[PDB]
Amino acid sequence: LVYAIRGVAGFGDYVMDVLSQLRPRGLTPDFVLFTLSFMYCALQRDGELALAIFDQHFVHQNMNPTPEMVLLFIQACSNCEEPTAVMLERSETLIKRLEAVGSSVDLISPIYDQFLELCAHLGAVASGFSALKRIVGFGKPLTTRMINSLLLANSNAISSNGSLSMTEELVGFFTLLKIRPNADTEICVNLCRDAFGESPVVNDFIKVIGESLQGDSEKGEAPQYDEDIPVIQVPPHELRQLRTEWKLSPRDIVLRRFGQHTKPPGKAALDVGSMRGSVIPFGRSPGEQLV
Amino acid sequence: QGHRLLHGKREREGSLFAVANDVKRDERLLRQQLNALLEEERMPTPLVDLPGVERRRDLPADPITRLFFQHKGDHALYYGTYDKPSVLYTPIYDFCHRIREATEQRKRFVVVPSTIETRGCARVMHDHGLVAGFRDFHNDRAFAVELKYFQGDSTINVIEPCSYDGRTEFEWSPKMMRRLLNTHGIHNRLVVYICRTADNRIIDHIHAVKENIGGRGLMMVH
Amino acid sequence: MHLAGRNGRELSVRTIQHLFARTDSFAEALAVFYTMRRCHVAMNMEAYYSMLYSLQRLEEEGWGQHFRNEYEENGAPSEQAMDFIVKGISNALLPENKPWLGRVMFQDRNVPDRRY
Amino acid sequence: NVSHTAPGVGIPDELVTAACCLVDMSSASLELRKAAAGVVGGAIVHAEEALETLRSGAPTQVRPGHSFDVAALASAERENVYKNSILQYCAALQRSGMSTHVEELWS
Amino acid sequence: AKDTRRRTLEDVLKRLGKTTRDLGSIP
Amino acid sequence: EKKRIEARQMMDGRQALKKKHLDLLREFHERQFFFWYERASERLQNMNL
Amino acid sequence: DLACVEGDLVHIKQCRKISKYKHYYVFSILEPNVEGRERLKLGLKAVPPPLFGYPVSRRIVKLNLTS
Amino acid sequence: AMEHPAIWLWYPWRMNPHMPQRRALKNVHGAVFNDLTPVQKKRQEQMLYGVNIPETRQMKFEEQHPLLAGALRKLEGQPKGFPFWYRKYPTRRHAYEYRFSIPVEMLDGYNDDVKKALSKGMMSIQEKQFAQEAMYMERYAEHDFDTTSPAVLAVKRALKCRVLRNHLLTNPHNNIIKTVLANTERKLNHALRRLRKVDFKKYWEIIRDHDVQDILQPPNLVTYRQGSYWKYDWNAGLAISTNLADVMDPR
Amino acid sequence: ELVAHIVRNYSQIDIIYDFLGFNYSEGYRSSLRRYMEYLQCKTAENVRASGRLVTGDKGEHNILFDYCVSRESLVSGDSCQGIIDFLYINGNDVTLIIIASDNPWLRNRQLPHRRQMEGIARRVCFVLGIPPSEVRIRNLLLPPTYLDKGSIVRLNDIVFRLSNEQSNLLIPWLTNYNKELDPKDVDYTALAKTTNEEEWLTL
Amino acid sequence: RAEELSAKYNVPMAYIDDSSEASNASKSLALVMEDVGLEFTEDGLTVVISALSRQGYGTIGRAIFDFASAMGLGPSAEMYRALMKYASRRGDVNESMALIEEMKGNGITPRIGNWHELMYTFYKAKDYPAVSQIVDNMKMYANIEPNEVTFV
């Protein structure tokens, strides 16, 4: 039901009502249904529907989120029109809850890339800059899209944070680490040039970008922009089900097929009819010495 | 946000369960070593080997006994060196059985398992002069009884639990305590009968008659 | 570092603590981290924790220069500058709100505190 | 009704966003714009006292689990949700002569 | 009490830090 | 009621101490994983032949 | 109102004669069986029925399986 | 830079008398692995990575058999260095893709034969059963080093019952496995019956997912007729476990 | 008539009302903030107040920062060392004003570590530009449900650097304030004795 | 440079001469203690404090103890015992218990000599069952086996 309406807009209240229909029908939502609902939220890029699902349908389950679930949640929150800081708070708590438990798949870099894109669309410079230590601690390399998201966060930071040295540090992230600049980098540094200051090292890096992007266009290459992280649209019968099979039958357990033998306890009957002695405190003869 | 309910004394005391899949594994030694790793030497002060209480209100009211205790925050837990001895039914039954089997072998210390009603019976036996002393008495798991001997033989002659079969317990009225104080037509301060009151105080048969109370009878010893 | 990763020698704890003490900014220390990650050098677990503590202290002084750059021109601190004083960096390996994350690792039972 | 209930601080948000469209149009009758200016100025002073009671009730909404910028972004959104309303109401009053009328209504 | 203070719109706009040219060009 | 309140507060303190000791055990298992990584890499170097 | 499900810890009280063997009534449900109600929502029985019970005779009731 | 002041007296008995940290680390490594039973040390070797390796980096089998455990050749070639990806794998239940809980980042420069010999097809029966255990441990654990949650313990008992039933299918004349299955089914009943009371949502998910709806049923009618089946909830301390505000309306 | 005279003459009767432990709804924390703001406005004499931040504009640091409410910030069953209520920077001195909790298992978690106080002082050196040679940071512990006379005297001595005579000149009702510590709370008095007798931590 | 010289090479502060008033005071104290047969060590100052304490002189021995503890020679349990000898000879119970709580607060576990001087303090103050109480609590809580002086 949730996978059928996946590429159809306007059915968000139907998704919100379907999740409320499980309780009168006796069903409880599992992680597959939450990943499909967040897949709908990430494909329709609404954002408020994923927060509405998370706040009053997913918190009460007290279950462990899969990395695909966190990836679809941050893809819904980042790509939506007019994001809020409440979505940043829910994404930070979901990232810390995912890191508090384990996983088998490797979705650290797209989750942190979409988190940096959400910090770009919200203007949170300190939240995205403090998230670089988490990419460092997991050993993942920095790409051009993450520093482009940091530059876009520095562009939209004018009330909150950001200064003339922050764009110089983001320029140095492209300069000395490894990362080659992009055709989306020259838009982000030009947006960060506005209402921040001269910064002649930033102007030198803009001139270096204007020479390099002219050189690769002289060689004949296509203008490379930041690629979009794709949304996983796999059917629910292949969604990494966390179960193999239990072929147990309770009829063979209760009726004790295969000769299931329970050893009886040793003289633990404890009945009243067999007792024929009067019970006195300390017994009849309390202190008896064998001589 | 729904939170998981803590079920049992192991989850309510916050057990780590470091050993894989085993919930009944003993935890005091590893937790004591981790708590010893938690403390640090502060330089401009560390803790002593005396026992500690977790709260300042848990200090003893005696000023001489308060010299032997100090205030440790979370390092007051997991104190002790002896562990729970094994190989019966009741801790009072095991406490009587180990003393009875170690007074015949003429041993100096008996490691008995420390419960609430065990260390109170031991304190009452130490007050009446049947026990010379104790070792590691603040340990909540097991403590050593230093026995008393005089001219070759043991001071404790007969020590028997009230639950002689180990299962059936008894509730003594104050009429029973007055019977135990005047038994066989004499005045009995010789044989010590010990009970546990409803206020969880371990009281002998003399002080129970003195304030007209009864309790659950634990053991006798003379 | 490519030569050190080829010969297979371990960098000591005193070496890397002195290596990241000569680093001025936060951007230069990430260059040293991704060089030694690329060159596949070996070190101790204390050498990794003392490295990430230097990355924690280099971001903290970077925001301290930023929040004083706006203080000198405005004359009074903001609520975000005073919130940086109490809280500081949230995402950290060894944060100050739980001062027990270096007792098992380091033999000295103390996080090394550098001063300038 | 809102000019009657101007001390009646319980006010629906529909009545102001409907009267702003009455301010924005030019072909309407001029007598409706006096009450439209009255409800707009009442919502302006209600947003002002809402900003003052939001700034006075500062330390109840702060969570120490966040960083120094997430609480700042939350307080900035809570203040901007009142600031953008005033920026919309004064921009609606800019295209009419009622912005002079609320000056004499306030004085 | 500040009863002689101006109760116009302009002090409200300068408390929010906006000029009338910014309000003419915002929507 | 005072006894029940202080019992609940004692349980909360036990939970906090459990969290601290779990962090210490995390660091211990990290250094044991480092030992395992050294031994496993030394064995895979011989497996490569 | 038919709210008692098999598995509820209930508090009953004495009352008048309601039927030939009914002189008590459910005063409060101190603990509802959540699993029984969720099984009744699924269209199943509240409690799955036991496979053992009372026999029909002292003679060993042999189950006959023949063609 | 300055010259030190002169020491004017000294005695050798002052020089006669970090080590508590080393003793506590050795006692911690003893209480974690060395002071256990063998059936607990096997599960500790299954779960944790380097509990066998002590501080001295020499195993108990290595110190008695140095030629068989130690490496025979010492090659100067491709040193892997420090693992920067170690945060993803704190326990061996996090990496069950390859054999011996080897992560994907450890096999980088080896050819396809070494990667194929450590694949899922080459795993043993114990490694496949531990992968099945870790599949549910990824789903129901509270933290990464958690193995004693009731949802985790219930699925561990159920996987054990499945293994014992699959052994009794091909070999019905094994009389020990009959008693072990009869004990493991009762322990599974206890674990699921406490999971039903302490966390009903995970219990209902486990019941729905694995097609076992009647796994909690009373065996006998005569004992069920007297309320002895529901007396388990009172006698185990589970009667007030369900939150009434989150399920029904308690008014 | 008596309540009218109390309201007219005693302008800070809500502060004395909350400080004596009569307020069971919200406590004395807001009255403590209003008291400290009133005592800052009569010593710095040029005060700007924006939300939860009060600052003097003389160039000398006179800053009162209302950080959080530690009653709701202290999560029961959490491992987080150090949650303060107020932060007062007076010249070169730094005071972490903490109201203790009713949970005795949370008072040991409420006070910050020495390393955390050194980090806070280093952040003060970074933000305010004050050199770290003369920088002192000191904890201050206050009683949970009330505020006794000795706590207010220590608050005037340490935080605002006022003696008894100038505090009686600025505050008239301080002389007749006779609230003392309750005898049945002995662990708080031990913790406050070990805290208030501590030297200023120098970075 | 002596303060880090004392920390690097495990030398006490009194053993380092930097031409100070404290260095000259330690030199005069060691020059006097050489004349009476002692060595100016942890064990010599115990004899100094005990010989001062048995002749009155509580504040003088306490000042010598504070100068010794400030100059690197650590406050061992036997120096606290030599301090408690003054209160034991005088019979002042409260000063001896204050010294017990002071050595507990400084991180020094009280050995059997401290409990012996506390028993002698309660004996000199005519509190005779308190000696048996200290013996019982030392066996129970302190886990210290009694010597023959304990029986004496």
From TrEMBL, chain C:
It comes from the Eukaryota. This is Uncharacterized protein. It comes from Trypanosoma brucei brucei (strain 927/4 GUTat10.1).
UniProtKB/TrEMBL annotation, chain D:
This is Uncharacterized protein. It comes from Trypanosoma brucei brucei (strain 927/4 GUTat10.1). The lineage of its organism: Eukaryota, Discoba, Euglenozoa, Kinetoplastea, Metakinetoplastina. The chain holds residues 860 to 966 of 966 of the full protein.
Automatic annotation (TrEMBL), chain F:
The lineage of its organism: Eukaryota, Discoba, Euglenozoa, Kinetoplastea, Metakinetoplastina. It comes from the Eukaryota. This is Uncharacterized protein.
From TrEMBL, chain H:
The lineage of its organism: Eukaryota, Discoba, Euglenozoa, Kinetoplastea, Metakinetoplastina. This is Uncharacterized protein. GO terms for cellular component: kinetoplast; mitochondrial small ribosomal subunit; mitochondrion. The chain holds residues 67 to 322 of 429 of the full protein.
